[PDB]
């Protein structure tokens, strides 16, 4: 009973966090096997950060200039390479706490837990979504860079995010664990246009299902609709279009709730067109698009790790 | 930049969770040193739960009837006692992962992270507040009972909550780690009147400060007010009264934000009386009372553990 924004357990990831210092700059890093992953902007000084040539800056640097503190204990850097926008420091020790893990790139709309860190020390954990414009709405102060986002599949930790930039706009940008930015971003302190953000339609849908499951059901209407009809209204309200794929993903919830996806769409249209009239759905006055269909089923069916 | 609802890192607590089975019933338990803490309602069968005499039921039970699975591994129960509404099973092994810890009772308004569990396995983590009527608004399915809530002070884990009841109303009740229920609750499947819940005034205040810190500041007015004046309006909107103590606690934020508590109150009164007019404060259409003054300073100043 009840339904909340819920992060994964952070333990396994906690034991992979390390501090990485280079000259002045210090930030977080991820220690897996004999390799530590971190942002290359560690090697920038303030001036560089306006337009760094990352080729030239690294050439000047050598193993011994990379200080990698694993909590209390130093680690011996024995090699370094740069893969897109990430840095990869090889070290004599393999992390004994290395979990079962993968690196995945995620699609916009998919959620993950962030473990926010300063000086390689865990600070707090929260759930986020990859916004359609490839930004995230997290909580990141100076030093948060290097913090990772991840999912868990029973015992396996898919890392999907590493934080790099706090955009002038106060949202957030970063890379997959192969250094490729999510979105049109680059690692340099400049003005950077992030696009129109739209609302993640399938998630909201999935969120309404959870509500019905939890007895918030005032929003249920008799009406039905069609994809074409609804999308026409979505576009109007900056919602992503809806696809058969989305519907297919919303299938299990339909089967259990006994509410056909397209009637739910009906409910949504009404909300969009009419607002909520001072009503709340699961203690929120607006609609929540940061819950995947999967996210609901896990929470509602009580999956453990 | 940005500001979110953020739980503590769950690792240290993760390694204290164990499954506890007795007859049919199975639920979570907390293994610390050679002691495992769990709800006594484990020893109830369905029928008992309408009106269990906990004295008589335990008398019938003996050590060997308590199955305590530590993930994979069984533990040898070598003694048992009942302390108010908690059960305390002594075992030959002391948990090697036992963290530095305390047990605290918390006051209403104070927040903590819940680690929701099924079969002694971590499921997910979220932040909660002790509502003025001593309920919580979490996410708890059958088996969630035994899950604990806690805070962290650098390296020390104050446990403040263990979950027992999912109330007919769809909110939640439980004990401190000495078994004394928070609130007027008891461990029996009956209708249980939880009181009027009011809104946690100081928290909302503290929350507005974070907003201003994050550049949401449209709600800032020129007006000022007094305690007496404001409280008069609070009572009207079911807000807890405000005390010099609350103000004293809001002092640091005032000093850094340069906004005197009582002007902030001014802003709040206006919001209460006028609503938000379709505006949002930190991506919420209503006001957030589940953030302590401490909670803001940690997040905003970036404290680690």
Residue numbers in the entry:
A (entry chain A), B (entry chain A): 1 to 305
Cite, word for word, the article reporting this structure.
The SARS-CoV-2 main or 3C-like protease (Mpro or 3CLpro) is essential for viral replication and is a promising drug target. The E166 residue is known to be a potential hot spot for drug resistance and yeast assays identified substitutions which conferred strong nirmatrelvir resistance and others that compromised activity. As the E166 site appears to be a hot spot for drug resistance from in vitro viral evolution experiments, we solved the structures of two substitution mutants Mpro E166N and Mpro E166R, revealing how E166 mutations may compromise activity versus drug resistance, respectively.
In the Mpro E166N mutant structure, N166 forms a hydrogen bond (HB) with H163, an interaction not observed between E166 and H163 in the wild-type Mpro structure. This new HB prevents H163 from hydrogen bonding with the glutamine side chain of the substrate, an interaction crucial to substrate binding. In contrast, E166N and E166D displayed severe reductions in catalytic efficiencies of ~84- and ~74-fold compared to WT, respectively. Expression of Mpro E166D and Mpro E166N did not cause a reduction in growth and grew as well as empty vector controls. These results indicate that Mpro E166D and Mpro E166N may have defects in their enzymatic activities. In turn the crystal structure shows that the asparagine prevents substrate binding through a new hydrogen bond with H163, providing a mechanism to explain the significant reduction in activity.
